[PDB]
From a paper:
HG3.17 was evolved from HG3, a higher-activity mutant (S265T) of the in silico design HG2 that was engineered post-design to reduce the active-site conformational heterogeneity observed by molecular dynamics analysis of HG25. Over an evolutionary trajectory that yielded the HG3.3b, HG3.7, and HG3.14 intermediates, a total of 17 mutations were introduced into HG3 to produce HG3.17, resulting in a catalytic efficiency increase of approximately three orders of magnitude. To evaluate changes to the HG3 conformational ensemble along its evolutionary trajectory, we solved room-temperature (277 K) X-ray crystal structures of all HG-series Kemp eliminases, both in the presence and absence of bound 6NT.
One of the key active-site mutations occurred at position 50, which was mutated twice during evolution, first from lysine to histidine (HG3 to HG3.3b) and then from histidine to glutamine (HG3.3b to HG3.7), resulting in a novel catalytic residue ideally positioned for stabilizing negative charge buildup on the phenolic oxygen at the transition state. All HG-series enzymes bound 6NT in the same catalytically productive pose as that observed in HG2 and HG3.17-E47N/N300D. In this pose, the acidic N–H bond of 6NT that mimics the cleavable C–H bond of the substrate is located within hydrogen-bonding distance to the carboxylate oxygen of Asp127 (2.5–2.6 Å distance between heavy atoms), while the basic nitrogen atom corresponding to the phenolic oxygen of the transition state forms an H-bond with either a water molecule (HG3), the Nε atom of His50 (HG3.3b), or the side-chain amide nitrogen of Gln50 (HG3.7, HG3.14, HG3.17). In addition to being held in place by these polar interactions, 6NT is sandwiched between the hydrophobic side chains of Trp44 and Met237, which are part of a mostly hydrophobic binding pocket that also includes the side chains of Ala21, Met/Cys84, Met172, Leu236, Thr265, and Phe/Met267, as well as the backbone of Gly83 and Pro45. In addition to adopting a cis conformation, which is stabilized by hydrogen bonding to an ordered water molecule, this peptide bond also adopts the trans conformation in the structures of 6NT-bound HG3 and HG3.3b. However, starting at HG3.7, the peptide bond is found exclusively in the cis conformation in the 6NT-bound structures because it is stabilized by an additional hydrogen bond with the Gln50 side-chain carbonyl oxygen. This hydrogen bonding interaction helps to lock Gln50 in a conformation that is properly oriented to stabilize negative charge buildup on the phenolic oxygen at the transition state.
Author numbering:
A (entry chain B), B (entry chain A): 4 to 303
Amino acid sequence: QSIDQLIKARGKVYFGVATDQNRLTTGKNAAIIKADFGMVWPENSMQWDATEPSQGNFNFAGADYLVNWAQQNGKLIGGGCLVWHRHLPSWVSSITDKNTLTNVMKNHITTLMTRYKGKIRNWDVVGEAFNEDGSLRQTVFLNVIGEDYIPIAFQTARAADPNAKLYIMDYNLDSASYPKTQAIVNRVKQWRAAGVPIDGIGSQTHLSAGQGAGVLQALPLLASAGTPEVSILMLDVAGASPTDYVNVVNACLNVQSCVGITVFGVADPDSWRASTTPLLFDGNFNPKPAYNAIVQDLQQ
Amino acid sequence: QSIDQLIKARGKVYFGVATDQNRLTTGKNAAIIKADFGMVWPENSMQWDATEPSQGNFNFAGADYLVNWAQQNGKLIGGGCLVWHRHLPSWVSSITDKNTLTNVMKNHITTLMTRYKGKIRNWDVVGEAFNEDGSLRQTVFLNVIGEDYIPIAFQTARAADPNAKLYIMDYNLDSASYPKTQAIVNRVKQWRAAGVPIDGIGSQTHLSAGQGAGVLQALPLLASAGTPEVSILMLDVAGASPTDYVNVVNACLNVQSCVGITVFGVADPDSWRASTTPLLFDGNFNPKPAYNAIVQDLQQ
Ligand SMILES: O=[N+]([O-])c1ccc2nn[nH]c2c1
Ligand SMILES: O=[N+]([O-])c1ccc2nn[nH]c2c1
């Protein structure tokens, strides 16, 4: 059975997966995505280092391939990350002038979003903006533009494509008692109360064995910020226990504003942490017990 | 135990593999390439659709990543394919003017080769130019420019980087009695007699089970064209029988002008024909029997 179909039958929008051109032309990835998943995200092809490796020199071939494949196969598309220190080329982080950085950031956002205007359901606009203690991470954007870079990014994104749902994303939001989780919720509440157009919080969910249960409490806390949507993104679980995966799915089901879940690849050998076999299909492209456990949960 | 080291000890240049950025950041590919392979090729990142998606506007992010990684890790680099109908964007195949297409082709060759001048051992300049009956394939280049497109491509490439070995590549050159095999020999002999700088013939070797034995006769026939080098490229073998792989390796060893062998990926799940499990490492990144058989053959 298709986990995307089953999650839609439970009132959710999608079960998604990260992919890119050379996954779609190898292995069994295309067949599995066509049958079992409802939304695709670019694993790498929309990051800043992939799309604007030198100023104004945009590289869209990989992203274009993904968008076209998704449209021809009737899949939703997520995009990102527009503003993320981790995939930033050196030409950006060397800028020290506030006006120039504001305009470089705006141009990067606008160019990417305009190119795919109307085709992208979700954009991850700002990623990993928080330190573990809940303060704002001191990236080039914070240091040079100041704390208004987040309002600016979201206002710019809403203008570039008013159809898209605009998300902030972060990791280590998996426990309700962790300071980072409470910090992002209270900042998003205040931003939205001042009119910043943050439509969603996306939780980059990279779990160790046994950590799925904590998401059942963390995700309702993220939803308390009052955004229209929340999502689980980049999901993988070391060991791929059925218990951990089913707990994450049930957290999604329990939270009315949680629109769906995206797993960070199809098959274990193509994972960034392949030795932890953390995905739902094995190296032979066979569904693993965690896949079947999700199916059986969603049927009930 | 490294098949590249062992083939170098037998007097050859390399045992190589095709890869690209998102293979190097996932799985165990980087570790295996570091330990066991001596040359890397771009699986996709130097093809025309990837590098020049609109006229004169070049995308280098993916290819730059691979070249940098190879230099950091002491590996040789192959590049290609500069002129190949199978990865051609639509803007090229809609040109009908001979001068314009000639200039477009020359600019594509010169721009890529200049960017990496001195860093690339081998360039595959022209690919898949022959029909199965040995006539020239009627691609946009043949239809618009005529058969001079092949001489022009090679002369342009030699001027752009005189350090690089320049190859023509084709597939189905695996049997000495197949018409295509003798046809490429006939034409390469004629082009070299006219001063065209074709340094190598690269045989894109996609075998079915039991076809390795025929390479023992086909590869010496390809070498009879008199090029300084020949190579085995894009190698994969359905079923990955040790006998097939060893026969291909011994064909290389038997042909003085054969500089090396490149396999078309690391692990089975990442193959274009993964269901045929045709590579040297399995879906758990373990070396398969064919890998160990190559090790023993190179020591014997
Ligand atoms: O959910 N995702 O797998 C995913 C992948 C890449 C991304 N970049 N930004 N947001 C992303 C989400
Ligand atoms: O040998 N190769 O694997 C390989 C891969 C891609 C290519 N493009 N042109 N030549 C190529 C060789």
